[PDB]
Design a protein around this motif. Structure first.
Motif, PDB file in Angstrom:
ATOM      1  N   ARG A   6       0.828  -1.189   0.000  1.00  0.00           N
ATOM      2  CA  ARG A   6       0.000   0.000   0.000  1.00  0.00           C
ATOM      3  C   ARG A   6       0.863   1.240   0.000  1.00  0.00           C
ATOM      4  O   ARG A   6       0.558   2.225  -0.708  1.00  0.00           O
ATOM      5  CB  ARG A   6      -0.934   0.003   1.235  1.00  0.00           C
ATOM      6  CG  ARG A   6      -2.056  -1.053   1.031  1.00  0.00           C
ATOM      7  CD  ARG A   6      -2.948  -1.067   2.296  1.00  0.00           C
ATOM      8  NE  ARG A   6      -3.998  -2.109   2.152  1.00  0.00           N
ATOM      9  CZ  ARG A   6      -5.078  -1.986   1.406  1.00  0.00           C
ATOM     10  NH1 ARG A   6      -5.344  -0.879   0.706  1.00  0.00           N
ATOM     11  NH2 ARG A   6      -5.936  -2.990   1.355  1.00  0.00           N
ATOM     12  N   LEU A  21       2.694   1.914  -3.437  1.00  0.00           N
ATOM     13  CA  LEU A  21       1.803   2.405  -4.492  1.00  0.00           C
ATOM     14  C   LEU A  21       1.224   3.783  -4.176  1.00  0.00           C
ATOM     15  O   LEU A  21       1.070   4.606  -5.088  1.00  0.00           O
ATOM     16  CB  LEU A  21       0.629   1.454  -4.667  1.00  0.00           C
ATOM     17  CG  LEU A  21       1.000   0.070  -5.217  1.00  0.00           C
ATOM     18  CD1 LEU A  21      -0.329  -0.716  -5.378  1.00  0.00           C
ATOM     19  CD2 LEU A  21       1.824   0.171  -6.478  1.00  0.00           C
ATOM     20  N   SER A  22       0.875   4.039  -2.921  1.00  0.00           N
ATOM     21  CA  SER A  22       0.235   5.311  -2.575  1.00  0.00           C
ATOM     22  C   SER A  22       1.211   6.488  -2.472  1.00  0.00           C
ATOM     23  O   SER A  22       0.872   7.635  -2.716  1.00  0.00           O
ATOM     24  CB  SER A  22      -0.467   5.163  -1.209  1.00  0.00           C
ATOM     25  OG  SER A  22      -1.657   4.396  -1.342  1.00  0.00           O
ATOM     26  N   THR A  27      -8.465  -2.475  -2.431  1.00  0.00           N
ATOM     27  CA  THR A  27      -7.126  -3.028  -2.669  1.00  0.00           C
ATOM     28  C   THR A  27      -6.054  -1.955  -2.702  1.00  0.00           C
ATOM     29  O   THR A  27      -6.344  -0.778  -2.764  1.00  0.00           O
ATOM     30  CB  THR A  27      -7.119  -3.755  -4.032  1.00  0.00           C
ATOM     31  OG1 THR A  27      -7.425  -2.721  -4.979  1.00  0.00           O
ATOM     32  CG2 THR A  27      -8.157  -4.855  -4.127  1.00  0.00           C
ATOM     33  N   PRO A  28      -4.792  -2.378  -2.625  1.00  0.00           N
ATOM     34  CA  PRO A  28      -3.738  -1.351  -2.678  1.00  0.00           C
ATOM     35  C   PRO A  28      -3.820  -0.442  -3.875  1.00  0.00           C
ATOM     36  O   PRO A  28      -3.648   0.782  -3.701  1.00  0.00           O
ATOM     37  CB  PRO A  28      -2.449  -2.200  -2.608  1.00  0.00           C
ATOM     38  CG  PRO A  28      -2.889  -3.412  -1.822  1.00  0.00           C
ATOM     39  CD  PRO A  28      -4.296  -3.722  -2.341  1.00  0.00           C
ATOM     40  N   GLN A  38      -6.683   2.053  -3.151  1.00  0.00           N
ATOM     41  CA  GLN A  38      -6.234   3.061  -2.204  1.00  0.00           C
ATOM     42  C   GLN A  38      -5.360   4.097  -2.852  1.00  0.00           C
ATOM     43  O   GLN A  38      -5.499   5.293  -2.563  1.00  0.00           O
ATOM     44  CB  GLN A  38      -5.473   2.393  -1.046  1.00  0.00           C
ATOM     45  CG  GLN A  38      -4.890   3.504  -0.122  1.00  0.00           C
ATOM     46  CD  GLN A  38      -4.000   2.918   0.959  1.00  0.00           C
ATOM     47  OE1 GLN A  38      -3.875   1.700   1.123  1.00  0.00           O
ATOM     48  NE2 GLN A  38      -3.386   3.783   1.724  1.00  0.00           N
ATOM     49  N   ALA A  39      -4.411   3.668  -3.667  1.00  0.00           N
ATOM     50  CA  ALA A  39      -3.484   4.676  -4.234  1.00  0.00           C
ATOM     51  C   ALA A  39      -4.241   5.701  -5.078  1.00  0.00           C
ATOM     52  O   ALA A  39      -3.904   6.872  -5.072  1.00  0.00           O
ATOM     53  CB  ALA A  39      -2.429   3.925  -5.037  1.00  0.00           C
ATOM     54  N   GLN A  44      -5.854   8.018  -2.647  1.00  0.00           N
ATOM     55  CA  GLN A  44      -4.912   8.952  -2.015  1.00  0.00           C
ATOM     56  C   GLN A  44      -4.619  10.122  -2.935  1.00  0.00           C
ATOM     57  O   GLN A  44      -4.497  11.272  -2.484  1.00  0.00           O
ATOM     58  CB  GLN A  44      -3.599   8.230  -1.711  1.00  0.00           C
ATOM     59  CG  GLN A  44      -3.743   7.215  -0.627  1.00  0.00           C
ATOM     60  CD  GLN A  44      -3.833   7.655   0.817  1.00  0.00           C
ATOM     61  OE1 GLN A  44      -4.049   6.754   1.620  1.00  0.00           O
ATOM     62  NE2 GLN A  44      -3.670   8.942   1.130  1.00  0.00           N
TER      63      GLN A  44
END
Ligand code: HEM
Ligand code: HEM
Ligand code: HEM
Ligand code: HEM
Lengths: 146, 141, 146, 141
Positions: free
Chosen positions: B31, B34-35, C123-124, C127-128, C131
């Motif tokens: 997470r 990627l974020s 999922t990741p 989320q991205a 964000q």
């Protein structure tokens, strides 16, 4: 950045008084002393064990000149920072692996060095102008990170 | 700054985590990468693709450290001293990044603990991860 | 903000399942519980003393719905968040005096609430994408501060 | 943690500051409001014009508190207790803002202390102001 014309003039008039190699060595040296985790990129530069060693290290000096010379040349392109620094942004991400927080730390250290060097001439409005410039340069250096 | 209710909340949540702590540590890292892509600058030697065993192996180490911190919640500086030395003197990760991993661990726990992640437990976990972050950056300068 | 098609696609699909009423009250309430200094803006909302009082407070719920409804209408304009939120940005600066750091905190709490609500579906990569959107909304709301 | 040498450096620099502490506090605030305009959201009840009595008065209060912290550097929590309560429970200033004022206090000190603001003293002052900021935000939650 978006500086008003009088902010741009303030920035340019002060910079004309800066010895770039001197201030570049001083700013990079102080970055490495005040925020010592930034030394992680510079293991090849030799002795960084005391603040005196850092400040007098000829390779820190030489990198400081290189960094601040590219900063200096960016001041001629305040309208186009993202464009001026795009290739260096890519380099710092893909090859050098430099966290862009380091550019923000350097910017704050540079503002402290200018205050130290210019004293009362570094007035609150002149600082505000330089804060916009160092933020814009950090943002431009961080823009191609992925 | 962890009250007895905070400690109680953290031990209750992490105990539900249990043997999945390593899976969850790997997911939190994914997470984070990627974020917040600037965090990838600390791992240029890793394969960061989804499923990477390097990320999985590192996520287990991070989770195990957090398990040790929960267990030593009243003596975290000593229980984490070698990891504080490692991050301050070798890895030299800028302190801002600890907030980013902390947020991604909270999101991971939220996605896996529907019942347990109440507002009060969320507050206690956020305080706990801030305290862990503080210990890990305490020797930087 | 620039989103890839799989990122904008992901943002959109999830938001169609969001009950703004209920997520908005959960997100604002958790902000007030997890970062209690944000209660400084809500002195007239009554009882905020315990997580249970915050979460059941009807004025928190009502405001949460308002805030997320305005956030919702921003998802329909992802390519010009600044012009979408300009009026509200000026309001939050000049009339409400809200430090824009608060918008960043609410963004992060909202991501935690989505994760809690949707579980493994968040999922990741999803989320991205979120964000980037919540950072974009925070920056848009901060843009008219002076 | 403030090392013994840090404490020595801070006491010398502040001692130089001396009787100008209030003037420098007011200058630091003005620098903050101009450089970081979001910090003005905490002062909508002040006249923030240059030289205003409210800013000069507030600057002196900030400087006197820093003087207290320097005099009690080996017991800051105790010394700043009232102030940490005030910020945590009443003023509720977001913690990020403490970094902004700290930076502006360092710039003000740099601009007035040419002989004293050496790299080592800069490092020590930065750590000192981070420690004061940590104490002032310690009771927020
Ligand atoms: C104002 C901000 C900065 C500017 C303009 C900038 C500019 C540059 C320039 C022009 C180079 C040479 C690249 C080429 O050789 O093709 C470079 C290299 C490098 N920079 Fe940056 N830099 C900045 C900040 C930083 C910071 C804060 C760090 C880390 C703490 C850093 C780390 C490095 C490294 C490690 C190199 C490679 C040096 C070498 O190989 O000898 N830079 N930078
Ligand atoms: C909750 C906070 C964190 C915990 C508990 C923690 C824990 C650990 C542990 C247990 C290790 C392996 C030490 C080993 O080899 O013995 C490690 C290594 C490392 N950590 Fe941290 N860490 C934290 C946050 C961070 C963050 C925020 C970053 C950067 C974004 C980071 C970057 C690294 C790096 C680059 C390694 C070396 C990885 C390897 O080469 O194998 N850490 N950490
Ligand atoms: C996504 C971020 C946000 C959006 C889109 C947003 C939008 C709004 C909207 C639509 C209004 C109603 C204005 C009215 O009916 O005059 C409002 C009011 C308000 N907002 Fe924001 N808001 C956001 C974040 C926040 C945060 C994080 C805080 C503070 C922690 C805040 C504090 C306030 C206050 C104090 C009001 C006035 C409530 C009243 O009337 O007592 N907002 N906001
Ligand atoms: C070095 C960090 C700081 C110190 C030592 C400090 C100290 C003080 C002291 C001494 C008071 C007056 C207490 C009294 O009159 O009962 C006060 C009040 C106040 N402070 Fe802080 N402060 C710091 C940081 C901040 C920051 C970062 C902000 C916001 C950007 C802030 C905003 C306020 C406000 C709004 C007041 C009340 C002013 C009034 O109405 O008179 N402070 N502070």
């Amino acid at each position: 950045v978006h500086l008003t014309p009088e902010e741009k003039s303030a920035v340019t008039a002060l910079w004309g008084k800066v010895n770039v190699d001197e201030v570049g060595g001083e700013a990079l040296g102080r970055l490495l002393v005040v925020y010592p985790w930034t030394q992680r990129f510079f293991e090849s530069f030799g002795d960084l064990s005391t603040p005196d060693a850092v400040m007098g290290n000829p390779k820190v000096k030489a990198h400081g000149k290189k960094v601040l010379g590219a900063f200096s040349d960016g001041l001629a392109h305040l309208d186009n920072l993202k464009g001026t620094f795009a290739t260096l942004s890519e380099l710092h991400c893909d090859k050098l692996h430099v966290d862009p927080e380091n550019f923000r730390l350097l910017g704050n250290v540079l503002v402290c060095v200018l205050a130290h060097h210019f004293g009362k001439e570094f007035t609150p409005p002149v600082q505000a102008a330089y804060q916009k410039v160092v933020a814009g340069v950090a943002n431009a250096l961080a823009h191609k990170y992925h | 700054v962890l009250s007895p209710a905070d400690k109680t909340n953290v031990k209750a949540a992490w105990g539900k985590v249990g043997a999945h702590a390593g899976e969850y540590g790997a997911e939190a890292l994914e997470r984070m990468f990627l974020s917040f892509p600037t965090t990838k600058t600390y791992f240029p030697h890793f394969d960061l693709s989804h499923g990477s065993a390097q990320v999985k192996g590192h996520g287990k180490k991070v989770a195990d450290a957090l398990t040790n911190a929960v267990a030593h919640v009243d003596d975290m500086p000593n229980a984490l001293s070698a990891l504080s030395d490692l991050h301050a003197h070798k890895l030299r990760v800028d302190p801002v990044n600890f907030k980013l991993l902390s947020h991604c661990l909270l999101v991971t726990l939220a996605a896996h603990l529907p019942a347990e992640f109440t507002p009060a437990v969320h507050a206690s976990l956020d305080k706990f991860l801030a305290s862990v972050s503080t210990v890990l950056t305490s020797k930087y300068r």
